[PDB]
Amino acid sequence: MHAIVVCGSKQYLVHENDTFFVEKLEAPVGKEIQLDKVLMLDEKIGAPYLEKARVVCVVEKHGLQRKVNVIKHISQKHHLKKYGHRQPYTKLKVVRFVH
């Protein structure tokens, strides 16, 4: 009914029909993707990893988070460097996970 999945370097706690945002996956919108890394699907602990168990997901959009306007200022010492950044995410929801 639940699951724990390792997307990117993060671990998520997903249930049926949950939209959770992960890093970029280079996948077109609508494709069924199988996040291979997994552990604790249902009362089953795969010690390093949970082998042969898969979770199937469909992605929803490729967006960009709110702008992080990072500016560093060495105080009173001639420095006003400026930079901007927009981390891209991929919003995807689960459909069904293989046992």
Binding site: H2, I4, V6, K10, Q11, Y12, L13, L39, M40, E43, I45, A47, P48, Y49, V68, N69, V70, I71, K72, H73
Partner: protein, 114 residues
Amino acid sequence: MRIKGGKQTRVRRKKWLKQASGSFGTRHASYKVAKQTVIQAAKYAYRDRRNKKRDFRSLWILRLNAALREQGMTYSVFINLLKKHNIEINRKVLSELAIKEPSKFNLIVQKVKS
């Protein structure tokens, strides 16, 4: 030719002012103070973007130790029973969130007792 340059200065200070809203007093009115406040706010944001990932880890540690003390063992003993045997790569955010949906985390604490 002689150049006055009215639009550019107004646009620049307008952008700097707009970056700061909700500020107390004249900080949201005077550009000369608005720029300094924006600098300090961005410095604080840069510091807290690291502080928050430094701190949420401690928060998870606390809310995990509190749960573990109700089963008869401490957090420090727990990690060994994860690492040395019954090896797992379960993060501390989910080893903490799973308590919010219990009867499944107790499976974790009993599995390591083997």
